[PDB]
């Protein structure tokens, strides 16, 4: 399974994103093959092992 | 997010992670050589002039086969790319319904919202099934093409120096169709068609594994492209990367070549027909299709 | 002819440059196609390509399946290509639980058609079958493509991996306590002549014996009951003219240390098999014995 | 009277170790020695990590 914490830590490229519809609508209507959504602040990325 | 007033539920901050995968589509084609060709290719019986003629014939046979197969490989690459693009491209009524209902929902669709979506689907499917047969008004087709261009979303990578003209205002898309349709459009909208020279990359870009990538491929069966840049930015504390691994793999040299473009509301796109590729081949042009109505 | 010509040892097939490179060098012309090394150029195994409908391809996705050609008694498909696993359904040798398992696996129209065609006619089973070899590839689709070797080892493009031959455990048969160093493997079909209809037994035998007469004597020792049944039917039921009590076909040779036990997984169901790690195919015809 | 080490030993991660730890959850100690020896084609490392 995809490890989202690695994406969360590693440097990223700044992009102007363009979803035609609302992001939560495209995600809820299952546009993307794999998806992770969390609210607030998730401590998962901090426990490097 | 936007701050809310008294008595309303506040919107919590949220982050979204998505990932996209690649798909593979190999192509192939055979060519054949006869044993008679092979024996005379590498044999000299007494060296008489007839034997020299036969040697020359075998050499030319294999050379013709190689050239024909290389041309076939180029054509097959074009064919495969076009098939992939057609596979991912939805029809006009879907995309126009989406663009007209973009602000409708900020969540998964209700019953009512998707009922409205379905109504729009049906109406637009009936209204625009055969565009050029039911109308040839100049303004209407111009607006329709403009809508087709506007509906598509932007790409996440953009090399600003490639596919540009001497008029250097940049090109944004390509519109492809059969020769007859392109002829009809060009004659109908000639006030917007122009002939241009475009700078395009002269060769494929090169992507190379680094030795760190080799070590990680051996040990963990995975590579992270541009490993050293990631490590340098991570250790220095900079959160953002200036470029993308695939983008920096792009070719440097670019060549000029001639093609036709159309203006679609401060947006210029290229027009092409692929009649050349399928001129005398066995494969059918994938832009010529059948449609069923019941 | 001269002394230097006789003394000259033959050219190495690997140090001479191939025909395409020869032509390109002769004209000094470049080509996009990579040409310096030709793949499969040194495969000594002989292979063939077979098309098979989607329903029949199950447990043959993994390499190492034995491939049989069966006669339909019809002109529209004429022949079908089936595996030993499918014959596992019809064989009386296979146990009830395994029969149920691999009957649940082959729940497709094509497989059921194969079974109906097999049971429909009045001929014995072996007259309807022709053995092709072992398979090592799959390209899936509505019509799948299988490549099968009919003389040689089983291996991929670079010989970086050698494939085994998979036999279902109920069909595996040995008749010696300590194995000889070199083992020959045979296919056996034996008929039991009970009252209503013949029930066929199907086996794959691994043996050290290469001589036909000694092997058939051992087989007649092991299958005495079926021979008794054959004679009993000959006595009780005239105007039924049976032939044969069994047939034996040779296909392959392997070393005794290569023999192992293993399982196969398909749609999260486990089938247990015997595994011949470095098996090389060498097909014979059906020889019949009484 | 015998001679004994005066201080503890110190083991420290390389930046590439940090990258592989974050991405793959794994560390190959003395990563650059492996890289250089593998590329140069020589089979033996001088000593372990």
From Swiss-Prot, chain A:
Top-rank taxon, per record: Viruses
Subcellular location: Virion; Host nucleus
Positions of transmembrane segments: none
Signal peptide as annotated in the record: none
Family: Belongs to the herpesviridae major capsid protein family.
Subunit structure: Homomultimer. Makes the hexons and eleven out of twelve pentons. Interacts with triplex proteins 1/TRX1 and 2/TRX2; adjacent capsomers are linked together in groups of three by triplexes, heterotrimeric complexes composed of one molecule of TRX1 and two molecules of TRX2. Interacts with scaffold protein; this interaction allows efficient MCP transport to the host nucleus. Interacts with capsid vertex component 2/CVC2. Interacts with the small capsomere-interacting protein/SCP.
Function: Self-assembles to form an icosahedral capsid with a T=16 symmetry, about 200 nm in diameter, and consisting of 150 hexons and 12 pentons (total of 162 capsomers). Hexons form the edges and faces of the capsid and are each composed of six MCP molecules. In contrast, one penton is found at each of the 12 vertices. Eleven of the pentons are MCP pentamers, while the last vertex is occupied by the portal complex.
Protein known as: Major capsid protein
Species for this entry: Human cytomegalovirus (strain AD169)
Phylogenetic placement of the source organism: Viruses, Duplodnaviria, Heunggongvirae, Peploviricota, Herviviricetes
From Swiss-Prot, chain C:
This protein's name: Triplex capsid protein 1
GO terms of molecular function: DNA binding
Keyword Cytoplasm: no
Known role: Structural component of the T=16 icosahedral capsid. The capsid is composed of pentamers and hexamers of major capsid protein/MCP, which are linked together by heterotrimers called triplexes. These triplexes are formed by a single molecule of triplex protein 1/TRX1 and two copies of triplex protein 2/TRX2. Additionally, TRX1 is required for efficient transport of TRX2 to the nucleus, which is the site of capsid assembly.
Organism: Human cytomegalovirus (strain AD169)
One Pfam family recorded for the sequence: Herpes_VP19C
Entry keyword annotation includes Cytoplasm: no
Record's subunit section: Interacts with TRX2, MCP and capsid vertex component 2/CVC2.
Record-linked HAMAP family: HSV_TRX1
An example Gene Ontology CC term for this record: host cell nucleus
UniProt entry keywords in alphabetical sequence: Capsid protein, Host nucleus, Virion
Gene Ontology biological-process entries: viral capsid assembly
Compartment annotation: Virion; Host nucleus
Family listed: Belongs to the herpesviridae TRX1 protein family.
Major localisation: virion
